[PDB]
């Protein structure tokens, strides 16, 4: 298992513009287009991202290209973030994938906000960190996905994804 595979299971793949869990226009493998409630604004962001008149449909390849860019961005963002990098540096490979997934979903800023859980993860207090992460809107809104990432941090294994 690896990050790409993990996120692919979490986000799925849609080739047409769709609304995510929060009702925002998205395409591909969880690529957010815009938070504006206008479909036109979305189509325009879409063609701007792909570089062609898409009419709101992209191919698989185009989806995977946005995904590759998005994973790269996530990692980079983490490494650039003063709160995040030290956490990432401290972790094992599997747990690093769990942090990336969170960053992919919520952005670097939202993650950086889980101060207390970050701290627990850095100290390697697994069971505690897992309880604290569960007290969040994140877990309450997308509980199955959150359980999966949480279990990953708790165990340092991919079992949640098996
Ligand atoms: Cl983009
Ligand atoms: Cl969920």
From Swiss-Prot:
Optimum pH is 7.3. Its EC number is 3.2.1.17. Gene3D superfamilies: 1.10.530.40. The active site is at residues 11, 20. GO terms for biological process: cell wall macromolecule catabolic process; defense response to bacterium; peptidoglycan catabolic process; viral release from host cell by cytolysis. Changing residue 11 to Q: Complete loss of activity. Changing residue 117 to F: 10-fold decrease in enzymatic activity. One of its GO terms (cellular component) is host cell cytoplasm. It is found in: Host cytoplasm. Changing residue 20 to A/N/S/T: Complete loss of enzymatic activity. Changing residue 132 to M/F: 2-fold decrease in enzymatic activity. Changing residue 20 to E/Q: Loss of 99% of enzymatic activity. Induction: Expressed late in the viral replication. InterPro entries: Endolysin_T4_type, Glyco_hydro_24, Lysozyme-like_dom_sf, Lysozyme_dom_sf, Phage_lysozyme-like, T4-type_lysozyme. It catalyses: Hydrolysis of (1->4)-beta-linkages between N-acetylmuramic acid and N-acetyl-D-glucosamine residues in a peptidoglycan and between N-acetyl-D-glucosamine residues in chitodextrins. Substrate binds at residues 32, 104, 117, 132. Signal peptide: none annotated. GO terms for molecular function: lysozyme activity. Keywords: Antimicrobial, Bacteriolytic enzyme, Cytolysis, Glycosidase, Host cell lysis by virus, Host cytoplasm, Hydrolase, Viral release from host cell. Endolysin with lysozyme activity that degrades host peptidoglycans and participates with the holin and spanin proteins in the sequential events which lead to the programmed host cell lysis releasing the mature viral particles. Once the holin has permeabilized the host cell membrane, the endolysin can reach the periplasm and break down the peptidoglycan layer. Belongs to the glycosyl hydrolase 24 family. This is Endolysin. It comes from Enterobacteria phage T4 (Bacteriophage T4). The gene is E.
